Write a structure and sequence with these properties.
The structure is cut from a larger assembly and holds chains A (50 residues) and B (53 residues).
Chain A: H1 23-31
Chain B: no helix or strand
Classes of the chains: A mainly alpha (50), B little secondary structure (53).
């Protein structure tokens, strides 16, 4: 019943940290390791059958 | 007559943006209608709009 929507320019908004040039490369190499990598999942990561 | 003068009181520094010296809209930045340089309406985002794509 008669309604519309239209949009154009969408931007990214990173609010990370004002970090060092010194520690950044040092902190990068630890996560760049083959041994330690970012693990992520859900509390409910279950599949459903409808 | 007043206490003010030709070679007058010095001001401590000079004020950084354009608007410390005006109170005029008719001459504004690429607009027909513009909200005044001192008014109450200027303190809040009066979003100008029309349908885009």
């Amino acid at each position: 019943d008669g309604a519309s929507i239209k949009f154009d320019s969408i931007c990214l908004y990173a609010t990370f940290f004002p970090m060092a040039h010194n520690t950044a490369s040092t902190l990068e190499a630890m996560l760049r390791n083959d041994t330690n990598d970012q693990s992520f999942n859900d509390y409910l990561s279950a599949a459903n059958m409808l | 007559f007043d206490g003010s003068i030709v070679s007058s009181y010095l001001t401590t520094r000079m004020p950084p943006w354009a608007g410390v010296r005006q109170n005029v809209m008719g001459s504004s930045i690429d607009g027909r209608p513009v909200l005044p340089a001192n008014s109450t309406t200027l303190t809040y985002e009066t979003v100008s709009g029309t349908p885009l794509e």
